[PDB]
Amino acid sequence: MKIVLAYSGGLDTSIILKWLKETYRAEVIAFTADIGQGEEVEEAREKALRTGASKAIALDLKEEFVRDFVFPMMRAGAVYEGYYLLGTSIARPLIAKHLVRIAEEEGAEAIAHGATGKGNDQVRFELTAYALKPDIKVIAPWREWSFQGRKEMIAYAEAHGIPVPPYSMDANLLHISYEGGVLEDPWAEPPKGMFRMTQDPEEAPDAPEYVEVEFFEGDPVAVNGERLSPAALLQRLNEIGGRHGVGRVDIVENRFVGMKSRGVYETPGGTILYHARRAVESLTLDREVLHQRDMLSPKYAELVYYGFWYAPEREALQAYFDHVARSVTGVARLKLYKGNVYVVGRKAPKSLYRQDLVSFGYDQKDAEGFIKIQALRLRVRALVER
Amino acid sequence: MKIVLAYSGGLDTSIILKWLKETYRAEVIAFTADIGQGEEVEEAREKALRTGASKAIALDLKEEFVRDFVFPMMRAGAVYEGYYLLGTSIARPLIAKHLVRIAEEEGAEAIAHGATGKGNDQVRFELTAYALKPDIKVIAPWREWSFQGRKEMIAYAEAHGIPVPPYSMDANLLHISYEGGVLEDPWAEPPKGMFRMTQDPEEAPDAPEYVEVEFFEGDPVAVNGERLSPAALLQRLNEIGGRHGVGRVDIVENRFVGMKSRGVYETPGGTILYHARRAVESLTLDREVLHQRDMLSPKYAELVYYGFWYAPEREALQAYFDHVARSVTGVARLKLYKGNVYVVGRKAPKSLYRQDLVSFGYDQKDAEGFIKIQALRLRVRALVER
Amino acid sequence: MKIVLAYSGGLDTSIILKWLKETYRAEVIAFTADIGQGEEVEEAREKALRTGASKAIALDLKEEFVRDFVFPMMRAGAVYEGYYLLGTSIARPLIAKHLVRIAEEEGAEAIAHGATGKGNDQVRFELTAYALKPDIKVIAPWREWSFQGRKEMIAYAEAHGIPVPPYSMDANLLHISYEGGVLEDPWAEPPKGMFRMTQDPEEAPDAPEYVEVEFFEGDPVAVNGERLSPAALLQRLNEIGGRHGVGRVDIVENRFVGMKSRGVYETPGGTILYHARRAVESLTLDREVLHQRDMLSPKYAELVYYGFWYAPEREALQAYFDHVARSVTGVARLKLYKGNVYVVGRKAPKSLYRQDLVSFGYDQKDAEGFIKIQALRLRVRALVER
Amino acid sequence: MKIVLAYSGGLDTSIILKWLKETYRAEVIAFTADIGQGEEVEEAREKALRTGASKAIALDLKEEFVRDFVFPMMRAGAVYEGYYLLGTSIARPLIAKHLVRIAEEEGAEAIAHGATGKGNDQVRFELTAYALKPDIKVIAPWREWSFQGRKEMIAYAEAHGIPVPPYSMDANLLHISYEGGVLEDPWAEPPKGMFRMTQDPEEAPDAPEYVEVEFFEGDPVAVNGERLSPAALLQRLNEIGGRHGVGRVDIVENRFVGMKSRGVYETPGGTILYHARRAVESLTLDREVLHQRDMLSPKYAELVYYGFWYAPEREALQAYFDHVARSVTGVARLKLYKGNVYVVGRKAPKSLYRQDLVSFGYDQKDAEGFIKIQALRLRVRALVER
Ligand SMILES: Nc1ncnc2c1ncn2[C@@H]1O[C@H](COP(=O)(O)O)[C@@H](O)[C@H]1O
Ligand SMILES: Nc1ncnc2c1ncn2[C@@H]1O[C@H](COP(=O)(O)O)[C@@H](O)[C@H]1O
Ligand SMILES: Nc1ncnc2c1ncn2[C@@H]1O[C@H](COP(=O)(O)O)[C@@H](O)[C@H]1O
Ligand SMILES: Nc1ncnc2c1ncn2[C@@H]1O[C@H](COP(=O)(O)O)[C@@H](O)[C@H]1O
Ligand SMILES: N/C(=N\CCC[C@H](N)C(=O)O)N[C@@H](CC(=O)O)C(=O)O
Ligand SMILES: N/C(=N\CCC[C@H](N)C(=O)O)N[C@@H](CC(=O)O)C(=O)O
Ligand SMILES: N/C(=N\CCC[C@H](N)C(=O)O)N[C@@H](CC(=O)O)C(=O)O
Ligand SMILES: N/C(=N\CCC[C@H](N)C(=O)O)N[C@@H](CC(=O)O)C(=O)O
């Protein structure tokens, strides 16, 4: 039987490829997606073949990732529990999508992934798979094998000749996530030198740096006047924001499976894009549209976090967010300095701001009437209380 | 006829004090509240007497301000349009409340304030006034007078004996607001040296400073182990954060009155408290409670911003927020560095975090069933689309 | 100067026509719309010319009314304060839309309407007018003249040759509204004989009547197998629901301008449609989509009620509702009997219901896992309470 | 080993009692609760002993049911998916609460119930149990045993001495639920004579009946002037409403475990109470409070439906609803007639309604300013769209 494995190249997914051959005596098709992890995915592909894969596929999905997953999510202003910009979250749907497509192309029965039984990833992979191919068979080795502990897995690794070696990392174009190990104690600061995408604030330039991001109908299309594709644009902002230490988050979040866990994230480019968008929105979105939009963002955020990307409720909300984002066209000017992102300017060809309405269509006495009417129900209330 | 005026001691409320006397020929009781503007209010009380007030009152309302207004608001995680911590907004209700109490005490049928006809403050003072005493009369000189320029106001000031002297500011224990003049161009960065409460990040300490804030049942009670009263606590955090340049935001916001306005704010202490609270909340609040609470916060924020403090909607929402906030007990440890605030740790007596649930609360198979049930409707959907 | 008046042919708008001519020395162009009031609008168009209009326009807007206003609103499941199906609310935008178009075509700088200064209609008319043509001038005589009472208005009309003839009515294809007069006492049942669109349930047929309503992509397209245009369809359902006394509501509502008002409404066809729609949705909409949709309906309803039809917030929500409603294709079967409507059956081409899953893919063991995971956070909370 | 079983006295729970003793080599303590199912609970209690229970407990929980579960839910205006008044949903928590208490008193390590593995009840029972006593062991025979059909179940019972006897029913003081069998076809009207709690509208009195319900701080306290305890009050309204065939619902709902199912419900008393409460609320609740409250009700409804009664989200929302409900004091007057409930009058000690404001403080010109300000952002938008 054929099985398509989401293969990263790491120890665990390598142990999984061997485990699947041995346990299911199956023809394993390894799949590695280049989504900006900063690893030569071609090395993962050869290592998979070396580890026993009857086939290995490596694809550059950086553009699809940002264009079809990151951008739509950003248009919605999605933020989980106040700080998480969902770097790992929106990536999983993309990977499961291809796993399913590859399985259908290679006539494979099942697909497998290496997310553990304690997290959100397992849900994201599987909900995506079932939503796309309801008849698909899914295998989650972390839930199915008998290994108990790192020593056993390493022993098993060495036995099969698999290359063996504080926290665990998950990286892609949007961010790098860190959790586990020393990070499991919520009272303990992350260890110095852990971050990789972002330079330390204390080591960031002494001179602030200005950057401008242009948005067209809800999506960023240029940086400092240079038109850049979705992936190239995220990359560029990662470089600029990274040098300044921008986008570090440290939170204890609530997993979908029920328990809290301490996660640390660095999202330089995405963080710049979060504030740039709101800056352009401040001139281009209507007050009531904005207030409504912000009260829905958190719901869309948990949908992404839990793994309901290819789910009707998320696609429905997307219709709202996409409609609203269509008006977001303009430029945000931000000032980067030692870990912070400061909005310092913004402009738009169809700005709703009118200096003439605030400087010293507006008649001062209309305000009295507005106030009296707004006050009526409160006055009736007070009088009734006598 | 008696009129109680919200008197700050500035040129405008000074001009207003004279204007009221001439216009209404009423005795004016000047009221000056110390809410942390960093001004000697007795100086304003005496100047009010020199300007013609038949009675000048000055009260230290710092503790009432933080305890009965800033704290209840903070418990709700109130943030207007993404960044505004409502520094000016929660202050007006307090002032109006005293204006109405004093009018009742002095037998004054009317109150007056110096907010302009183009803004939010006018609504805040008046909705509060009418909500507390329905038949009170309110006079807003800015909406009633004839001055057609700043030049005319000063001439009137000099012609009357009032001392006369790029943007307008409003300061109190929570923040300092800056808007108008040079700030009316949303593409222009605020002028160098404008900020007064926070030190320029470029001139802030080279070594980060750690700070710990203790929360008890939703309100902050100690800083670095020192128990502090509400106003004392906010003051202490303003000093610590200010020294580091923390809490600066720049936005184009939507006034309740219809038009957009470019505002700049520095909220050092409040910004530290915002993040400290969420840090403690991450260990003490249930996932679902939190998610629901966060979707209501934006609504509570617009209520405070529009001026509906003493309104049934806000008091109802307050019951919800207060209920949830009651569990927020613990300590947040934050790191301050050149303009930025970083959560680096948190602990709590009744933390819901359990390392054993994440360390390598259910067994693997449980997750499989959870996923299958969660996936059911998506699979039926896919099948029907057959 | 020219003024386009929303003229219904009644006493008040006739008085208004005369009043406008003299007060503004203007040419008044009368506009009467047939939106299902059950009155020969041509008679109103002629009475206007007799009354002094320089031009009188009358249009059959029944189809545009149902297709472009009633249907989009019904797709959203809009219900104001638990019962009001907004019959008068969605009709005002339509009227004002034509007033502004006619004003433009005739070179008129202003439009006028006869809604009083204490209601919602004035807001709906003007918000629509201003939103479509920002510099249009609106004249609301009720807020400008000084008639001291009814007697005075009758004498004015008698003096102008206007024919002078216990509650006020507003009728159209969607419903008939009743309020004012004897209806002002919330404790008093409406008088017998008041209803006109519906038969007293006590006089309704002794046998129940079954009716089927087919929906296609969110809108009703057929009744009892007969395909019917929007307006013809609402009419047929009015006839059917009407004969049985269906659609009667009696509520005390909150007007946008601040005071409560007692209103009585009969919406036979719309009431059948409300339940028919939900019946088809019960087979075609996903659970999460439905739940989110229902939490937004109320907001949409107040938007309509207040008059924000041609408003970006409303249009944005409409994007969401339209997206969801595109899945609503199927047939609802209802049973009508003495005042009530009963859903007794429903079917759909792409129904999501599967008897497979309820009769004795699904494995009961999965339910245990689902339950354990959902319970984890509750159990942790319990252990911490200790 | 001791196991406390939710014992209804029926065939399946009797089979379960025998099954539990042998499978777990344990003694079973049967618990039967009278919650208004209209059965003699002492009969089930005696039968449990005859079936082998080591102890059988039967309690009258009618008052606790209505006072502590039904009323709190009603104050929230809870309605699931447009029509379900949650009759079975709110009863389960109460039952499980007692199972856990009895287990603790009897020193039993586990509890058991007879809900199936494909429904909602299992979740309600278990989430409740786990929330109250996290270490409790729950046994759900339907998800554990090996019976492969109804005939084998009958053979097992007949073999154990248990006596053996088109849809399934669940009845209590709030309603009677009907689902399964012939009701599984959503296009088929339910069978004649199926309803038990309500008289068919065709047979109901030709004379309408007026009923008055007095509310005090959110809860109903009297019917037609007669003060009644919670359970006696619900009983009374069931009798009155039942005679008139009030409260019948026919829906295809979404279960928490993922699939749709056709359910039929009769809730005579609860339906009168639903409309009675809203009638009193129309005079006692503020507009904004009401609108907010209605947007949260559906969320609370799904919580109850899913089984999250003793859950922090639900208790947090309850704080909101209870705050709001406290103003709900007054009397509702309804007209009952052949299946329908018509609100015909309402009054309250502190009614916020003022004939003052609608009859022909308020000055129409305030309305113009209100409208102008409300329209500003719309005019700005229009001008920009040019
Ligand atoms: N770039 C990728 N290509 C293919 N599969 C991936 C990729 N990144 C993650 N996965 C899968 O999802 C899991 C994610 O966990 P982790 O690598 O610890 O962050 C891995 O164990 C893989 O099975
Ligand atoms: N500390 C205070 N005491 C009394 N009235 C105040 C105080 N702060 C503000 N106000 C009132 O509210 C207005 C606020 O204006 P502004 O400072 O320009 O943003 C002043 O014109 C006063 O009438
Ligand atoms: N069919 C119609 N055509 C034109 N204007 C109308 C029509 N129906 C109502 N109006 C306008 O809106 C107001 C509605 O008032 P009313 O009937 O008292 O509820 C009238 O005073 C008219 O100015
Ligand atoms: N009055 C009651 N006393 C004790 N247990 C009950 C009672 N009503 C329901 N239950 C439990 O919940 C299930 C309810 O029945 P059903 O509606 O047939 O799925 C039974 O299998 C019992 O274990
Ligand atoms: N650490 C890791 N990746 C990423 C995550 C960031 C995060 N807290 C999230 O849920 O996105 N591996 C896990 C995370 C998880 O499922 O919670 C696993 O496979 O079990
Ligand atoms: N500048 C000033 N104070 C403060 C406020 C910050 C802000 N944008 C807010 O609404 O709180 N004066 C005004 C503000 C206003 O009313 O919007 C006035 O009286 O008109
Ligand atoms: N009675 C009338 N029409 C209709 C109304 C139904 C209702 N309560 C609504 O707001 O739609 N005329 C008024 C209503 C109002 O503006 O509230 C007026 O023009 O003054
Ligand atoms: N029919 C019955 N009881 C009640 C239900 C009304 C309903 N649709 C609801 O979920 O409350 N038995 C089931 C229902 C269920 O829990 O979904 C079972 O034990 O499996």
Last residue of a domain, one of D166, D194, D221: D166
CA of D140 to the centre of ligand 8 (A): 15
Last residue of a domain, one of B105, B140, B166: B166
Apex CA B127: angle with CA B123 and CA B133, to 5°? 145
Q: Does residue C381 lie within any of the structural domains?
A: no
Task: Tell me which of D12, D68, D200, D322 is the catalytic residue.
Answer: D12
Contact D8 CB / ligand 4 (< 6 Å): yes
Query: Is there a single domain that holds both residue B61 and residue B156?
Result: yes
Strands C330-337, C226-227: pairing is unpaired
Q: How close are the terminal C-alpha atoms of chain B, in Å? A: 80
Contact B179 CB / ligand 2 (< 6 Å): no
CA of D92 to the centre of ligand 4 (A): 8
Neighbours of C56 (CB within 10 A): 24
Give the bridge partners for D260, in sequence order.
D254
The reply, when asked if residue D11 is annotated as ligand binding, is: yes
Pocket test residue of C60, C113, C150 for ligand 3, highest count of atoms within 8 A of CB: C113
Helix, coil or strand: residue B245: coil
The 10 Å CB-count burial string (b at 16+, else e) for B177-186 is bbbbeebbeb
Nearest CA among D273, D222, D265 for reference residue D70: D273
The 10 Å CB-count burial string (b at 16+, else e) for B41-53 is beebbebbeebbb
The CATH number assigned to the domain holding A59 equals: 3.40.50.620
The CATH number assigned to the domain holding A231 equals: 3.90.1260.10
Q: Cβ separation of D345 and C302 shorter than 8 Å?
A: no
Find which of C288, C295, C306 to mutate to test the A interface (most A CBs within 10 Å of its CB). C288
Helix, coil or strand: residue A376: helix
Nearest CA among B194, B166, B170 for reference residue B180: B166
Q: Cβ separation of B313 and D373 shorter than 8 Å?
A: no
Q: How far apart are CA A322 and CA D60, in angstroms?
A: 56
Q: For residue A287, how far is the Cα from the chain centroid?
A: 27
- Alpha-carbon distances of D162 from D13, D37, D44, D52, D159, rounded to whole Å: 11, 22, 13, 10, 8
Query: Is there a single domain that holds both residue C213 and residue C129?
Result: no
Q: Which residues contact C101 (CB under 8 A, 6 or more apart)?
A: none
Question: What domain count does chain C have?
Answer: 2
CA of C263 to the centre of ligand 3 (A): 17
The 10 Å CB-count burial string (b at 16+, else e) for A274-290 is bbbbbbbbbbbbbbbbb
Q: Which two tokens stand for residue B356?
A: 């054993």
Q: Does residue C369 lie within any of the structural domains?
A: no
Residue nearest to atom 5 of ligand 5 (CA): A88
| Domain interval for residue A24 | 1-166
Residue nearest to atom 19 of ligand 7 (CA): C115
Q: How far apart are CA A356 and CA A362, in angstroms?
A: 9
Q: Cβ separation of A385 and D287 shorter than 8 Å?
A: no
Active-site residue A92, yes or no?
A: yes
Q: Cβ separation of A316 and C299 shorter than 8 Å?
A: no
Q: Which residues contact B199 (CB under 8 A, 6 or more apart)?
A: B242, B243, B244, B245
Q: Does residue C211 lie within any of the structural domains?
A: yes
In the block, residue with structure tokens 């159209």: C172
Amino acid identity of residue A80, one-letter, is: Y
Residue nearest to atom 5 of ligand 8 (CA): D88
Query: Is there a single domain that holds both residue D146 and residue D175?
Result: no
Nearest to B369 among C351, C357, C365 (CB): C365
Contact D121 CB / ligand 4 (< 6 Å): yes
Query: Is there a single domain that holds both residue B145 and residue B213?
Result: no
Q: Which residues contact D205 (CB under 8 A, 6 or more apart)?
A: D243, D244, D338
CB C339 within 8 A of CB C247: no
Nearest to A184 among B123, B344, B355 (CB): B355
Residues with CB under 6 A from ligand 1: A 6-8, 12-13, 31-33, 35, 37, 95, 113-115, 121, 168, 170
The reply, when asked if residue D261 is annotated as ligand binding, is: no
Q: For residue C329, how far is the Cα from the chain centroid?
A: 23
Q: Which two tokens stand for residue A285?
A: 């979105």
Q: Does residue C148 lie within any of the structural domains?
A: yes
Q: How far apart are CA B306 and CA D279, in angstroms?
A: 30
Nearest CA among D155, D24, D84, D112 for reference residue D306: D84
Q: How far apart are CA D10 and CA D37, in angstroms?
A: 13
CA B314, B315, B321, B325 dihedral sign is positive
Residue in chain D nearest A375 by alpha carbon: D361
Query: Is there a single domain that holds both residue D258 and residue D298?
Result: yes
Q: Does residue C176 lie within any of the structural domains?
A: yes
Q: Does residue C362 lie within any of the structural domains?
A: no
Residue in chain B nearest D299 by alpha carbon: B292
Active-site residue A200, yes or no?
A: no
CB A80 within 8 A of CB A304: yes
- Alpha-carbon distances of D10 from A265, C8, D33, D149, D213, rounded to whole Å: 56, 67, 13, 17, 36
Dihedral angle at the C-alpha atoms of B321, B324, B326, B328, nearest 10 degrees? -110
CB A177 within 8 A of CB A171: yes
In the block, residue with structure tokens 């499980």: D96
Residue in chain D nearest A385 by alpha carbon: D350
- Alpha-carbon distances of D29 from D10, D21, D56, D114, D137, rounded to whole Å: 16, 10, 6, 14, 15
In the block, residue with structure tokens 């940086």: A223
Helix, strand, coil distribution of chain B in percent, nearest 5: 45, 20, 35
Query: Is there a single domain that holds both residue D119 and residue D266?
Result: no
Q: How many CB pairs under 8 A join B and C?
A: 69
For A13-127, where are the E strands, in sequence order? 27-34, 55-60, 110-112
CA of B279 to the centre of ligand 6 (A): 31
Amino acid identity of residue D262, one-letter, is: R
CA of A115 to the centre of ligand 5 (A): 8
CB C95 within 8 A of CB C125: yes
Q: How close are the terminal C-alpha atoms of chain D, in Å? A: 80
Residue nearest to atom 1 of ligand 2 (CA): B33
Q: Which residues contact A386 (CB under 8 A, 6 or more apart)?
A: none
Within 13 Å and on the Cβ side, how many CA atoms surround D162?
26
Residue in chain B nearest C361 by alpha carbon: B376
Q: How far apart are CA C194 and CA C116, in angstroms?
A: 23
CB B241 within 8 A of CB B269: yes
Q: How far apart are CA D257 and CA D140, in angstroms?
A: 16
Ligand number, closest to the Cα atom of D45: 4
Q: For residue D163, how far is the Cα from the chain centroid?
A: 31
Query: Is there a single domain that holds both residue B246 and residue B316?
Result: yes
What stretch of H or E contains D370?
helix D364-384
Q: What is the largest CA-CA distance in chain C?
A: 85
Query: Is there a single domain that holds both residue B130 and residue B192?
Result: no
Within 13 Å and on the Cβ side, how many CA atoms surround B380?
25
Q: How far apart are CA B101 and CA A220, in angstroms?
A: 53
Q: Cβ separation of D365 and A369 shorter than 8 Å?
A: yes
Query: Is there a single domain that holds both residue B245 and residue B358?
Result: yes
In the block, residue with structure tokens 């009958």: D154
Nearest to B368 among C288, C369, C374 (CB): C369
Q: How far apart are CA D191 and CA A138, in angstroms?
A: 44
Helix, coil or strand: residue C193: coil
Q: How far apart are CA D350 and CA D284, in angstroms?
A: 7
Query: Is there a single domain that holds both residue C142 and residue C186?
Result: no
Measured between CA atoms, how close is A42 to chain B, in angstroms? 31
The 10 Å CB-count burial string (b at 16+, else e) for D183-217 is beebeebbeeebbebbbebeebeeebeebbbbbee
Q: How far apart are CA B232 and CA D334, in angstroms?
A: 57
- The 8-class DSSP code of residue B66 comes to I
Residue in chain B nearest A151 by alpha carbon: B360
Nearest CA among D375, D70, D30, C368 for reference residue A287: D375
- Alpha-carbon distances of A104 from A4, A33, A115, A189, rounded to whole Å: 10, 17, 22, 46
Neighbours of C149 (CB within 10 A): 8
Q: Which residues contact D113 (CB under 8 A, 6 or more apart)?
A: D5, D6, D95, D96, D99, D121, D122, D125, D138, D140
CB B338 within 8 A of CB A201: yes
Q: How far apart are CA D95 and CA D170, in angstroms?
A: 14
Chain C neighbors of B361, CB-CB under 8 A: 376, 379-380
Contact D113 CB / ligand 4 (< 6 Å): yes
Ligand number, closest to the Cα atom of B263: 6
Within 13 Å and on the Cβ side, how many CA atoms surround C17?
30
Apex CA A98: angle with CA A93 and CA A102, to 5°? 150
Q: How far apart are CA A92 and CA A151, in angstroms?
A: 28
Q: Which residues contact B334 (CB under 8 A, 6 or more apart)?
A: B210, B211, B212, B213, B272, B275, B276, B279, B341, B342, B343, B344
Neighbours of D163 (CB within 10 A): 11
- The 8-class DSSP code of residue B163 comes to -
Q: How many CB pairs under 8 A join B and D?
A: 73
By what method was this entry solved? X-ray
The reply, when asked if residue A253 is annotated as ligand binding, is: yes
In the block, residue with structure tokens 């008939």: C176
Q: How close are the terminal C-alpha atoms of chain A, in Å? A: 81
Chain B neighbors of C354, CB-CB under 8 A: 380
Q: Give chain C's contact residues with A (Cβ, < 8 Å).
A: 134, 254, 257-259, 286, 288-289, 292-293, 299, 308, 311-313, 315-317, 319-320, 322-324, 373-377, 380
Nearest CA among D113, D136, D98, D158 for reference residue D16: D113
Q: Which residues contact C226 (CB under 8 A, 6 or more apart)?
A: C236
Measured between CA atoms, how close is A119 to chain B, in angstroms? 8
Residue nearest to atom 8 of ligand 1 (CA): A8
CB B327 within 8 A of CB B280: no
Contact B98 CB / ligand 2 (< 6 Å): no
CA C156, C160, C164, C170 dihedral sign is negative
Q: How far apart are CA D266 and CA C278, in angstroms?
A: 19
Backbone phi and psi for residue C329, each to the nearest 5 degrees, phi listed first:
-135, 120
Chain D neighbors of C130, CB-CB under 8 A: 375, 378-379, 382
Amino acid identity of residue D24, one-letter, is: Y
Residue nearest to atom 19 of ligand 4 (CA): D115
Q: How far apart are CA C263 and CA C278, in angstroms?
A: 25
- Alpha-carbon distances of C175 from C60, C249, D325, rounded to whole Å: 17, 11, 32
Last residue of a domain, one of A112, A141, A166: A166
CB A179 within 8 A of CB A31: no
Helix, coil or strand: residue C169: strand
Active-site residue D294, yes or no?
A: no
Query: Is there a single domain that holds both residue B213 and residue B110?
Result: no
Residue nearest to atom 19 of ligand 6 (CA): B115
* B169 CA: nearest ligand 6 atom: 1
Query: Is there a single domain that holds both residue D104 and residue D69?
Result: yes
Q: Which two tokens stand for residue C302?
A: 């107040």
Q: Which residues contact B230 (CB under 8 A, 6 or more apart)?
A: B63, B66, B67, B70, B71, B219
Active-site residue B297, yes or no?
A: no
Helix, coil or strand: residue A129: helix
CA A51, A53, A55, A58 dihedral sign is negative
Strands D137-139, D110-112: pairing is parallel
Helix ranges, D176-335 (H): 230-243, 268-284, 287-306, 312-325
CB D288 within 8 A of CB D352: no
